[model samples]
Target chain A: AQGLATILAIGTATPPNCVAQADYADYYFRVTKSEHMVDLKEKFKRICEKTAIKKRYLALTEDYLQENPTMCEFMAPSLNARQDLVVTGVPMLGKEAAVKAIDEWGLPKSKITHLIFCTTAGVDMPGADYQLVKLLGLSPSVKRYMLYQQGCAAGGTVLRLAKDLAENNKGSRVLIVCSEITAILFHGPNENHLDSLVAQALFGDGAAALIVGSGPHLAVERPIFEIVSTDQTILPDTEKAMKLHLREGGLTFQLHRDVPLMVAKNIENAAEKALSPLGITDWNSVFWMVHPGGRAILDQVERKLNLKEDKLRASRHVLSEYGNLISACVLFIIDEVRKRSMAEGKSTTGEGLDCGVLFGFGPGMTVETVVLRSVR
Target chain B: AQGLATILAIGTATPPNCVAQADYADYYFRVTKSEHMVDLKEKFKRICEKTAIKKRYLALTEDYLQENPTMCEFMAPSLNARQDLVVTGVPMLGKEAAVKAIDEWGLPKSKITHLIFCTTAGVDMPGADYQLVKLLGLSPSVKRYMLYQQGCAAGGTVLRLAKDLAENNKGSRVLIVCSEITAILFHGPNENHLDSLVAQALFGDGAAALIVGSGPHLAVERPIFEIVSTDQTILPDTEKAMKLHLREGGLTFQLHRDVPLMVAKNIENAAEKALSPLGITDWNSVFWMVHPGGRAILDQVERKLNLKEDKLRASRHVLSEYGNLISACVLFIIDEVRKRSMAEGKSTTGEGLDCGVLFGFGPGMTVETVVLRSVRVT
Candidate 1:
């Protein structure tokens, strides 16, 4: 019972600039070091090339200081207060950026019946969802939902939730937005800071808005890839491996070194589980929309899942170009694939290719995977 | 379209015992007030009879102290710590009370598809809604919603939300829970303390759970009250008159004496608007499920709207017996009416009571009103 629907538009926003690895170290050295730095830079460089991303944005705390002297004075005591400052600031900019994207993409606000907002930055009352609702001037009756602190995997989880809502209510249009200001939680260096350094160097601030529903604005008659199946696997007894703990001083990110290994070992199982329902057994034809959490996790996913080097090029390109935008990272990959297909005049739904798989891992040490196929 | 439904069971929990006005004043004077005892007690007595509330439960700070001695001692100095103590302790008690109510009402955990939790106390992560789901062993798929800091009017608002959900999703049952511990916010005698005192005198630490859906669970056919109309009116320029401010010294309730006058001045127009959709021009036949913010507010609504005193007896009874139970106060009135009707063996359909009106006012100095009807039983 596949209803008439398609992905009408896709829009993305990153910080105004990217801090290259060399320059990043100068400002973040107290927070970065040898074991994690080299691998992180390599992953970033690879992601840029593979994803076809020309530029990705970064929210610099310096921007806020110049604009608001009072806030700067308030944050003068902490070395990395900039991250928290930007985390608090990015949602407003992200909202503006999303509105701009929707305007340029030509999706009318009235047509959006559902708004799915994803973020792991700052959590505040009236939430960013309500703010977007007011800013967009959409109907008050428009259904709203927000997934907070879900971490990187939220990008795919958001799409799955959107799909569920859309499927349940025909003709419903959903706008899925994923934004992460991970920099806010970045702490200075320590022996156990490998995961944070890897996460920070590889992750950046960005947001992506996509329109999903049945409509005339649909660019591809059938989505180059629409999710066909989805599954979640939360590893037991490993909840502590990835945690977002709040302390009086600030938020802290805890990641166990064994996470990449855990992902690698379970990647095949999770992938098989996600794809089985879509009748996808072989990997050769699949276009992977894998989350680039960092170099190690990406490497493990590729090697353990036996994906070809060329297959991961888009993901690697996004990492290099924009760093890991956490939840927004996968959207960049999808955009790259769409761009490549457009240039080659390869319709998402033609003769041969029929399915693809997208996956991301988050703080739960949990993997959210979705199987998608070309709509004919 | 209205579908068939009935309220099968209901349960409520209040604090262990009721504190009399003199005893309440004793406790009150001990905390912060030394003088003006006679005036405060007189005010309490004057409002008590008009409010129709006899006694109300109070959850003491010491009860929380006994639960977690270490946390209480550590938080003694910090205002943030004290606020946390009140917020967390009430919900912890509320969850226990809700679970007991659910069991006593014979509700199957699996049947509850949604949990609507209402509170105006402290804020906590995972919220009380989620906490109840986990504590009560509700299905993981159960949708969770919290109507936070909505004030006394929240009870009616939550019922309205439940009705909307029930209508949208056919055959789904939603569990609605409202809990508040206003005793902790009580300060000594002062003009500014009137609202809190009214709340304290009428409000109690209690959790009331109701299972609402679109299917008949009892003999009544169709919903007991299909919300026919609703209205919200925010008074002009009186925001600070009744405000819930989070101060370093716990939550400070600032209630002005003008609240009763405001209700009296505007309730008629507001009530008319709510009944307009029902094709009813007269308020004569309607039973009042009025929020007993205090006796003055109730008297103002009664006199201003010309509601029969006999029709408001149930509302007055709840006020007298259970105090204000905050958001649960109105439901207590409805419960009393139901019990009295059953005791008299009067059928819902034969009563010919076509509709009833529920009203409550809160922090915004705003009035929330809804019209409901008794369904005909097969």
Candidate 2:
């Protein structure tokens, strides 16, 4: 049972309202209809300029908000209103993602014993675990662990726990669901809080789920990765570099100038420590699935880690297609990697291909990373 | 190696502002200076009459409130304001409680690798874990897990996790801190809301800490319980019996009439299942520490479990002095149990006089229990 925690399946769900990334500028301008934003029109328009995103999904669609305009006051949705948005939006997406994974993996509905749910966007009672159990008809006695305000890195964080618990306990299949409706933190452009504008542009609403079980069961059944190791490194004194500030109106996303640089500085040591056990050194040969915190963050990681281009295509493609789903996006990348790897054919466990690394950073300036090699 | 998770030490702390339970009714009336509450003075008096709590501590002192006023509006504090209170109150109490245990248990802050913090009271971040790590000078690499709004039952819940993680990780020391400034949910008596009235009377602010490690390393170090096992059983269909409703002002503490009856009905089965593994069938010989959710809960558990009165003396004593600290109370009992057991001298690991159980019930209408044996040397 010292074997790797294996991946069985991944399921991803998006909010119903898919908005074209290009239309965000017009949508904000029209809804806020605020004289406050008049001076910032050019700024908003420039920010909308994207790297490659054709569209992104959100809990509050422009189409719905245009009809019922009170959800937003001038620019951002009322913080009070956002609470209602989170409770409704999060579970709606979270449940779908979990259901899809359970069905795809053929996991029995009542047998999921470990549920770990992560969210940085907002709150839920009984919590996301309770909701998923009720929604999916999982066992009531399911051990539940919830991570909140954990930021973008938590997907990896929980996946690491899933690996440990599954491997250590044996026969335990850990179900993890991470969802973010980062738009809840969306504040319309104002002179004082320009970074809020950047935040709004970068995050979208989505939930991702995956199943982790012990031994070669999942490995033999499909394309799977044995979770080789997991490590979390929180850079000292960078606690304030990225954080969420709570308020009645909504959570405000704060990004520091040091964020991308911090990730660049820490990515190397993190990779080395997490990978050294398996004799990993060269970044080019290994598969790297980086959390798309931002385009700049992924680029900084690549440059500092000496990773080859296309090494992060899955990460980049996820960012381009979905912005960042905060804590939920890393699973999407894993799902993409799994589907691509599985296309060749099913293979038995212990056959190896590319060793892969999954890494993410969050508010603690915390680095959450996992090392894995395909169990072919 | 998977080994028995052992409890190394326990520490309890309270906020500086301690209030006499008897004076709470007048204190609220005087602070809000509200003429509206004068009419319901009788109800407040009766609510405070027989609950057995003499005094409780709080982050907001009556003196501070009397001087400041306007903090409570015959209502709970606003959620934003509660956040400020938690940020201020929790760490102050949580840190003190944690430091006390680390010092008593002689655990190196840096060596302690796992931190599990639980509360239903309010919010904290870099979380209670990170804040404590930074304050106590623990390494940044320590794994941090936080549980919030899990309700009173969370004490047993997190203890169970602590036991599991400490055993499974091997050589890992798990530092668990549970703090609840329940006063954050305090709502003065409203004619329309009876539960709020009962809640304000029964809950208090306190924090407790414990360190869980494994086997003889901790047992030889001091009085430690080789944690036998922990189990949780949720009463089917009673999910709504005791729940915290998230609100703009603050979490509304809801208690249904069926709660004590539900516990009364289920306690025997829960205790039987949790203890049957050890072949423990004699109820009277096994000592018990139950959450004093209120006096009726203790009475019901006693009646249904066929227990002697002294079996729940520790539970009643905690209720008499501090009422319920919600998820934090069970650790207080562990502290008390440890102190009293060690007073007589302690035994080596696995050999003891009486088998013991610690139990609590909360929002899930869930019964959570941990069975242990006193390792007191003859």
Candidate 3:
């Protein structure tokens, strides 16, 4: 019996202040001002335009951050003080999004039997795991799992974890929340590394929560997405391609030149292994949910996988609208698919949605893919 | 139909230096320059003595650590440079332990379908997950999962993950490695806090590796342990009972005094949740592989569960030998169970050793319990 877990629904939220890419371009130009850095103004414009992102929802804008910093140029905040300022606010942020989803699915917060939280930007002891357990007033005994510091593929990895729990634990409902505060990781310059440049231009602060389950009725047997398989592969010797180096100045996001190439070159094997079992030979036919690692990342993967127009609409849309939410980006895409498929007149047994392919890139410079099917 | 996953074997390794608890106590007093802090010296002695631990393997000896310092209350080291001196060595160290396990099980590194690494000490971008892939030449496509910053219960969590993979994914073999470089977390001083005192007295560096799979083609179909179920519960309001507070020095270990009481109060329900379905009502019987989180944690669970002295022979033996290896400790206990079972001449098909219970406590003031049964191999 290969029991499977089906996605119930997805809910997403963004901070109040939405800043356009052009505004940040001006800020970038001022932050890196000088003669030696002469072309950075045009460079910022080119990079911002190339990112395929229009705007992002930032937790705190440059104006707010310029007033309050977790660590100044050369001093440390008390651990408790830092957590109070930086880490504790996340649960409230993440909870708003989780409540939106729970409300959308018409399920109470107490129904979640498991909580799996994913984040790469927040740091704390009791972290979001215990924080959510307390703040949302979830069942006191709900099992909790935390996945952070895995970089962006956290969406795929956490979905895989939830799938295992839902399928194997029979009667289990898992609530997953992925949130990141890119603002906490805001940086000061050092040689004006381009890695910092991309991280600066792309990532936005956001939270996404969803439900995956196989137990307790939801009135009808409707599955938004049914997981077929999840697999991941790391490009050999490309360990340095993508990483987060920990400097005294918080975490430094690193993206080497070879990352897009590695993601393109190695994506086939990951996709093939996950799909071949499901008898999926044609990539173009599936509803693709590739991670919006960047415009070039999406383009390279599209070229390699032979995906054409309209295949990655959800991915591109989320990229344009939200920039990159890091690990939370995939959840945003999943929500996009949920809205499209779960719309009126098509909420039940929708056609033309036979399969969905998901791909996410992360710290291993790794590529994670999960094959999802529609059993509606 | 949910498939079954079984434990093939467990392998563990220690770092090069094995220091006695007494020797480390002397080293601790020297490092802290404790003449002014009489209370700390006595506290360290009492905690170290009460730990019931003898020797522990450490990644670096006190002698080596004495010469290098991250900060002197003034100058700074980039978090990366400090990590360079300490964290990077663990991938290779943990790889040594993992290689031993994979080789011991007589399985090629390439057979691993999933690789899950758990640690609380070492920190890096790629982490030990991607490092192991290249180090052992594992398949490029092997699925990888990482659990860190979770504290000690990561051992139970990772094993449960492996168990799920073996059962849900057919023809799956999971390679699980847990390693903690407690040496890197060694702090000179911040506050003479009780939690830091306990952490300084008990923790040591070590690595453990194990293999879990559902394959039937092994030369011998002997499975050391068959996972019956895994269940965990967080004590309602005890979130602050135990946590890892990050600081400029490193992670500040925090253990609130009420952790013992919480574990004692909640463990019964956790154990029953895992065992009731198996029709296991009695707690006395079953081999035990509880995490030696510390002496009190072991004692509290034993007293609460009504376990007899023999039930904890393996647990106590591990504590005495390896101190507390944090995330890597439970794997050592699992390894201990395997060795004694494999040692006896009449060990095969023994009716007495038919079941085992695993218990571990950590961060959320959470207690994790798993029920495991033996194959009997008759």
Candidate 4:
């Protein structure tokens, strides 16, 4: 191996929905202040009545707005002035939230030599990564990247970038920040648009940051995991099915219902290709860090991959609790798996439980998958 | 010295103009197609009659429109939509024109490991850098930075980023792209806004790309330019002076008259600070790559630095020919100097000159300066 980096720590921030599929109708309605005005709350209440949310925490920009009334008053009228508000806010949140998580995770800021900020939403000047450096008081020496407008599967794309950076320069700590504010782009309910319905049901605002490095820094006998191989599969002629169109008001998401079916049909082949390079023939042995894009997508993946109920518990948990945080969903799932592994009184990795599969889907109607192995 | 890199090759593209101030009135009247409609043409003709412009090229979205009609259509309506056309056009031009120049440079695409796209304009996603990579067929492995909305001084900022990358990782080639489309955001006519008049009198659409690396595959025997040190100076209580305010159609620019004075008074100090780190206290030894922000700004810089007429010739030439290409101005001036150095048969330490200063000014009413020395190939 030229230079293989291990995931040192994973941290996530999501809206308060710990368990997937929880009774959050009242909560959602109350927070949005739509309980009295819109009948959609009743529909949300009906659906969430059966769903259980496990764990998630929402970082409210509105709360910040409340603190600075003058700022709010000044910007309130222009809040929805440009589509950039939603698209750009996600990366902003990703920066702030990831900094918070990185602080909580106790990784020295100095260890992070490269910071990659990934998002598909709004992009602003100086970029979130540059702003993050000043806000977090990170070292000026740290290299920065602002990977903008890489839809959906961009999370995995960012990981691949980190791996490449780490491999090229030995012993470098790379931070991958994935943040999405899909909820902010939410349009008023469109009864005729199934894609909008799916979006409304699945998308949420959240951010996650993961630290990866080649050398040992954290006191783990075995690190979280080491990437073995990565594979990218972009379906042909399906660019229209999952597209992000820049419009006058904001970004309009086009998601086809057939996405789940498309993933279920093609993902197995993609997974095989990703794993075959690493000499893994059987999927049964690997723990899946699949993106909780949506509940239906997860169910489709489970049925297609033929995984056991507990095999996808982490993803299902994240999906039910936090909805879909877009690029941040996979990181959240990875965090949950790490938490569970630690809680089980098991070492980070034991003999034979070494391999895992990570995957994410986004625009280009693409899938980004990677294979990783735990090093002892 | 730990992993210091040198700029090897530079390419620039700008709108066309000719020698003499009087030519600009003709050029402006021609480009605006307002010759028949406005008395301002006579006013512009009178104002620019004595201005000296050696040669310049005008870059119209029209040229790109033939191929990318959709993009042009999207851009055309948006051009006159704002008063800050000078500021916004720089990035847009940089994004498209830089790619064209990069292709023309014919350097091995894979060698470019990182990209720093700097501009202050209408920025959108997939970013201009990503588009450049795709257009150039460069390796997707390149790390990208779309440094958006930084004012004129941002050209120096990009070099700072390049120096940082090279310092951290040896043998890496970083590409810096700067473009500005200052023509599109032009406000028709306003006597109260001297800044707009100055901007209209100067500033043009242009793009420039520079490849910075430390390795052996350079065109120059020893690259005659190293980024020795950088200084970023922000003015006090002047945030509102140079502002990029959003308007109904697009963005508006407000440049205060004190800008040139600010640059004239402080640029020398900033340059001294940048040069001090290089252990080169004497400013007279190096050529100046000052941003020709405008005609008056250039005069102020020349007066403040006490530079000889010929010393500031390149900056004047670039400004007269291409207007102030905003962020691209400094690079164009450097390119001009490199051409002259070659013409004069001056070889760096091994190939041409040894040291020079690169400077750019922007909306911050701020100045960014860097000191550089030619790489010595012993």
Task: Give the DockQ (2 decimals) of all models.
Answer: 0.10, 0.43, 0.52, 0.13
Residue-level lDDT of model 2, residues B1-378, one tens digit each, is 456777887789988777788998787666656446766766877877867788887786666455433346555336666666776667668888999988888856887878888887665445666677777787787877777666777888787778767766768888899988875676545677777778877888888988888754634457567678777656788877875655555667778977889888888888888778888888886778889888888888898888877777778888887878998998787777666665645452322356788887876667788887677554
User: Model 1 TM-score?
Assistant: 0.65
Query: Against the true structure, whose lDDT is highest?
Result: 2
Clashes of 2: 8
Cα lDDT tens digits for candidate 1, B62-147: 45544533322211222344445555655665676567556755657788776678776654433565456656767754655555
Q: Which residue runs of candidate 1 sit more than 4 Å off their true CA positions?
A: A1-18, A29-91, A101-134, A138-346, A349-376, B1-60, B63-94, B97-133, B138-346, B349-378
Which portions of model 2 miss their true places by more than 4 Å? A50-52, A62-71, A74-79, A216-223, A344-352, B63-71, B74-77, B215-220, B344-353
Which candidate number maximizes TM-score?
2
Docking class of 2: acceptable
Residue-level error in angstroms, candidate 2, position A160: 2.4
- Consecutive 10-residue window with the lowest summed lDDT within model 1 chain B: B70-79
Docking class of 4: incorrect
Error of 2 at B60 (Å): 1.7
Structural similarity to truth (TM-score) of each candidate: 0.65, 0.93, 0.91, 0.69
Chain A TM-score, each candidate: 0.82, 0.91, 0.90, 0.82
Query: How many angstroms is residue B20 displaced in model 2 relative to the true structure, after the best TM-score fit?
Result: 1.3
Candidates' interface RMSDs, in order? 7.5, 2.7, 3.0, 6.6
Task: Tell how far residue A276 is off in model 1, in angstroms.
Answer: 5.6
